Amino acid sequence: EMVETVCGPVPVEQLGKTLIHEHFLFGYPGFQGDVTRGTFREDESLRVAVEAAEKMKRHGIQTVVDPTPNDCGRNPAFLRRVAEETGLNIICATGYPYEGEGAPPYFQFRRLLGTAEDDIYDMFMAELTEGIADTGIKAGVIKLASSKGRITEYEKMFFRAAARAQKETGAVIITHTQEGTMGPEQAAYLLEHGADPKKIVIGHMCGNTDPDYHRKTLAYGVYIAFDRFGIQGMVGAPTDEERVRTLLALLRDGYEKQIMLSHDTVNVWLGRPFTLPEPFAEMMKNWHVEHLFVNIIPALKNEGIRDEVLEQMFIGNPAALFS
Amino acid sequence: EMVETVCGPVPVEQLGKTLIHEHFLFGYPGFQGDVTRGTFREDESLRVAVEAAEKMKRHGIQTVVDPTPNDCGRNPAFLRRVAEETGLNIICATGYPYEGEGAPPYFQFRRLLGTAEDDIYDMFMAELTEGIADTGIKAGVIKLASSKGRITEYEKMFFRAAARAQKETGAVIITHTQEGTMGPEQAAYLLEHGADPKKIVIGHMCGNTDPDYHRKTLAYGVYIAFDRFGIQGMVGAPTDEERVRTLLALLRDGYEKQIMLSHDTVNVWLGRPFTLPEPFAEMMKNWHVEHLFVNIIPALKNEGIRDEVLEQMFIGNPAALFS
Ligand SMILES: [Fe+3]
Ligand SMILES: [Fe+3]
Ligand SMILES: [O-]
Ligand SMILES: [O-]
Ligand SMILES: [Zn+2]
Ligand SMILES: [Zn+2]
8 A cells, every 4th residue: 555755655556657767866886986086966966866857757757766776876865855856756775786786795795704694684674664774764675686697696695685575574676687687587586485476576678689588587477677768789788679679579468567667767877977988879869768758659659559558557567566 | 205194294204103004994895785784883983993093002103004995985084083083194095996805897887988097097196186075185095906816907907097196196006915816916017007116015915925926026126015914714814823934034034124014904894793703703813903013023023033123114114115
């Protein structure tokens, strides 16, 4: 009935049109060391975040899930300021990134001491049921991530802790898959440890263009996410046209009640500013929060996707996911 | 004539008895995501640090080089509070940790953009000549680190940026070697790119117990640090007994003008508190800031080492290094 947001409990029936994976702030681990040349511009960042929320609102979005990992710039008080200003529901996460794009040392050390998995579980429980730091804000989802072609032993501690915390809380699990791999493995390993497939979103599924792969993942009953629309030519990502072709295939197979769509935008980059060089810059020009509604969804309409199906993906699925 | 400390410029003639490598604060990268259960307790942390500064003061220490990496909890305003309270000089660093104990994703990403090495030089320069963040404190040393058996291509970016920055500033370089490897390779690679051997300290050289390895590194003209006295049974460390035996052999060969000593303490761990399991716990029991002066230094004296040699290592060498 309720979900925890950055503005406290909101009824699930009032979530409305929802983007399941968007980052208002994000920084790659290691950004914290470049503070002198890449310090956080709080108020200009707010204006950018707020303006992104307003772009999203102009297409009817009422809720955004922001699954920024704990050490990647997750800032719940900042997200609360966005939501208070814009009236948008924002759900944040508890969790850590995968090995190759994260900071493994800290919890690697605690595995050596033999308390890592228990420490992760305790973090998850605290941030789900009490609050993050002193913000008073509970996370609404557990964020999980796995490496390319592998759920490493390090990563599996988080999967196991996540399953245990979901058994205790009912919290939704949202995942990251690296370069279109481990989708079925993620679902199977979480289920092995008692997670609920109805509360799982396997992410970055648009990273794999083989509809057999998605069907392997869908058979577990989980949700999948085509959540990187507009990312092309980097992090191994396929083209948007490949994303559209794979999605139409599944949708023409009757899989609407399990598919959610998003962009995985980074609206404010933490650390030092940058501009992508000449080739990616072109491929990445549609990586913004209006892309799905200005470009992708008109194309889906022309391919015969009906409003009820879209509405199923943007409204019905998040509502079922969080209830 | 002057070195920058966390209380502005200090004459090199006034540094006195110096510990070349001690961490007041330190956290393994990834500690930033454990904020709810591992918050930084400022008051108590200050109390603990101030006490470490006084324990060092009672054995004549007037200066400490704190080489904590930028993303490992380096906190120059906090260090300044310790120094102002205690009168100790504290010199801090600019630098990143090696791959296996750090967060590479951030600067790995900037290498894809082609800007990483330049960005690292820009960071070194700003922190050495302008200030860290808005603290007004300049780093006094560049901190470098490499992996076990390799100076990776990621690490080499920082090595080349450090050599570049030293050519511009005359700043001292302090290094971390992993598990007794790559001492000769660090010196050779730094000198290849124009770095000054009189301004380099190759660290954790006590991790290697073969005097030929040490002599190989010494042949480059650089300083070397037996800076891990008290660490045993962890991180591949050999015993203090092995440390002493190696150190006596070098001192008996006349190498005292190139050797410096320290413990590499972590006086306040960042993130969540922990307790070492019982095998490691007793082996580590001497890892504190008085161990040199209570245990190691007097046993060296019993073995014939003269007071003027010790003073060369604790006083003469830091003075030579920073001038
Ligand atoms: Fe994401
Ligand atoms: Fe150290
Ligand atoms: O992501
Ligand atoms: O260290
Ligand atoms: Zn992701
Ligand atoms: Zn070190």
